[PDB]
Enzyme design. Structure first.
Site, short mmCIF file in Angstrom:
data_model
loop_
_atom_site.label_atom_id
_atom_site.label_comp_id
_atom_site.label_asym_id
_atom_site.label_seq_id
_atom_site.Cartn_x
_atom_site.Cartn_y
_atom_site.Cartn_z
N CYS A 92 0.85 -1.22 0.00
CA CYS A 92 0.00 0.00 0.00
C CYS A 92 0.88 1.26 0.00
O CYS A 92 2.05 1.20 0.32
CB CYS A 92 -0.89 0.00 1.24
N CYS A 112 0.15 3.63 3.55
CA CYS A 112 0.67 2.84 4.70
C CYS A 112 2.18 3.07 4.84
O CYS A 112 2.66 3.50 5.87
CB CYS A 112 0.40 1.36 4.48
#
Length: 105
Positions: free
Chosen positions: A32, A35
């Site tokens: 991600c 993240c």
């Protein structure tokens, strides 16, 4: 200083080689973006705090360890000591890490 886990057997050894110094884990996704976007904050501590231990877990190749902490929202910061959870707080809050470390420092 930061170190990426690999599996369960590993997650154990790390807590066994970290003596007793603060052991803060960063349960987040590496694939991600948002993240690993909080990396220059939790990863940049490898130089500042040279006495504390830092680990990183990918909720993609190590879901075995993530599903072990029963996470419910990434990123999720966890605090371990002597091999026992003593603190845990989730949220995209990085400025909280510092003060939090001052909690179990």
């Amino acid at each position: 200083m930061v170190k990426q886990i690999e599996s369960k057997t590993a997650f154990q050894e790390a807590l066994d080689a970290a003596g007793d110094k603060l052991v803060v884990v960063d349960f987040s996704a590496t694939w991600c973006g948002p993240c690993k976007m909080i990396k220059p904050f939790f990863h940049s501590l490898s130089e500042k705090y040279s006495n504390v231990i830092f680990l990183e877990v990918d909720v993609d190749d190590c879901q075995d360890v993530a599903s072990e902490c029963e996470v419910k929202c990434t990123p999720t910061f966890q605090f371990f000591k002597k091999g026992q959870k003593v603190g845990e707080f989730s949220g995209a809050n990085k400025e909280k890490l510092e003060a939090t470390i001052n909690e179990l420092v």
